[PDB]
From a paper:
It produces the collagenase Ghcol, which consists of 767 amino acid residues with a single catalytic domain containing the zinc-binding motif H492EYVH496. Here, we report the crystal structures of ligand-free and Gly-Pro-hydroxyproline (Hyp)-complexed Ghcol at 2.2 and 2.4 Å resolution, respectively. These structures revealed that the activator and peptidase domains in Ghcol form a saddle-shaped structure with one zinc ion and four calcium ions.
Unexpectedly, Ghcol binds to two peptides at each of three binding sites, which are present in the active site (a) and in the activator subdomains, Act1 (b) and Act2 (c). In the ligand-complexed Ghcol, we found two Gly-Pro-Hyp molecules, each bind at the active site and at two surfaces on the duplicate subdomains of the activator domain facing the active site, and the nucleophilic water is replaced by the carboxyl oxygen of Hyp at the P1 position. Notably, the Hyp side chains form more hydrogen bonds than those of Pro in all three binding sites. Tyr555 is involved in hydrogen bonding with OE1 atom of Glu520 both in the ligand-free and ligand-bound Ghcols (2.8 Å), and Tyr564 forms a hydrogen bond with O atom of Hyp in the ligand-bound Ghcol. The OH groups of Tyr476 and Tyr480 form water-mediated hydrogen bonds with OXT of Hyp at P3’. Based on crystallographic analysis of clostridial collagenase, it has been shown that the C1 and C2 subdomains, which constitute the active site, undergo contraction at different levels (ColG > ColT > ColH) upon the binding of a peptidic inhibitor. However, as shown in Figure 4, the binding of tripeptides does not significantly change the structure of the Ghcol active site.
Numbering used by the authors:
A (entry chain E), B (entry chain F): 1 to 6
C (entry chain A): 90 to 622
Amino acid sequence: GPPGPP
Amino acid sequence: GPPGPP
Amino acid sequence: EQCDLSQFQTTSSNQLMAAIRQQGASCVNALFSADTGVQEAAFSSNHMYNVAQYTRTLAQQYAGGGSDELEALYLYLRAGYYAEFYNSNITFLSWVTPAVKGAVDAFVQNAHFYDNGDAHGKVLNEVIITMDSAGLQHAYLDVVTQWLTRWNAQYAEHWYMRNAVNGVFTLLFGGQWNNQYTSLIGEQTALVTALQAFALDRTKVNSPTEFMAANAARELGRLARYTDATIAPKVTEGLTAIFGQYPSYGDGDAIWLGAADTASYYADCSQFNICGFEDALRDAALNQTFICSDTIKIRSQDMSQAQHLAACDKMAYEESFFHTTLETGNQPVADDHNTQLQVNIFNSDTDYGKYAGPIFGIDTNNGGMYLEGNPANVGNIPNFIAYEASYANPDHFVWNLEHEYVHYLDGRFNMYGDFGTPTELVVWWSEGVAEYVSRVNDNPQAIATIQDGSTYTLAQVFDTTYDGFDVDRIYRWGYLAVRFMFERHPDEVQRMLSATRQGRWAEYKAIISGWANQYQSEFAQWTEALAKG
Ligand SMILES: [Ca+2]
Ligand SMILES: [Ca+2]
Ligand SMILES: [Ca+2]
Ligand SMILES: [Ca+2]
Ligand SMILES: [Zn+2]
């Protein structure tokens, strides 16, 4: 899925 | 499984 | 001064934006994993629409130099798509994404989009990532082609630019699950041209940007699945140039192997005459040989003699210690001829992640791996694969040397049949005995996981799987359960082993499920003592 936090 | 993300 | 996560739990779009611009990007981070009361409030479809419209007009005003506020605004937005995906209580309405695309378009169309600079790259990073979090990969192939074309040694000086522009490859990866992208990717000949030139630039080899060269090669290899599309010749032509310019092992092999990984999967190796590159790669990469004994052989990339000897002597120490702790009588299980072990040691985790995949066909998202083969096959020689690391144990400095080696011993003297044979879960035992024999009582993390308030029961340990790779549950609680049983019930351990040494997985499961009923009291008490002293 969508990229996590940096 | 398939090849993963960069 | 400090992050106030509660300020984001409001119905006021105005107050939400005040929290974003004041608390800054480092506090918006908390929204990724916040309570679903925080997430449901902070990511209402109105909030996303209003934040997006303010972000769009602010981004039209951007004048270069970076921007803490835009950085936090695009982070907030893409955090929403993260929250929509993982939280079932959140679904965005039809008009959210076209507003987010308006916000992203304003940054892309701004005169400063292709600026060089650390601060500018910090906001550009969030923008590139939002293109992916938000399902817009089909909308920005032109930007990918542009960044690939403009990228030069000056942009490369900045970590944040490398980090930001590396995002376009994740955009190509993520577009696989985007039907507008798959319906469109097949006509993108400018993109394929640019991916080729970027990957084939030799000045990237041995640079801080070699990983981007390798990601370009990998994503070009993905495009070889579109076997009849208009790009097929230029993808193929470009993959053949990569394979011909760079070596399979050596300077730039990251680019060669990146392309080989995806082009082999989504196409056929014979299209590029790289079929069977793995054998020559295995010889080139594990080019040393060192014979410990007539039963253990090391192949290594680059070890000193002093390391080889220390590894050989440490494996001999663990062998006799294993056999007295496990009461094997040195008698193997039946139908097992694995007398000889082969030990494969790469120079680092980096090398392991590059080479062990193609050579041994394993996944490298871990700290080493044991491969039993078929013990019943006459001539079978099992392998374990490992890497050197500075945190590994002296004097050999091989990460998990003793851990993987106990897997070899465990599989030959405790566990009947090859690795897949059991019809019940044995993850807790394999990883537990491997941790317990190699570490005995020196395991500060296993102690740590008792004190932190989160524990597991014997029943829960025994049913552990590799799914999700819960390192804490697998290795630390595997360790504690095996250690507890050995200290307080070594009789019971031998009865369980009597089943596993013969392959009676039903009786084995029966035995340990009894333990989980009775000894849960003992275990819970015994683990609190460890947290005491
Ligand atoms: Ca949802
Ligand atoms: Ca080395
Ligand atoms: Ca076995
Ligand atoms: Ca814990
Ligand atoms: Zn293991």
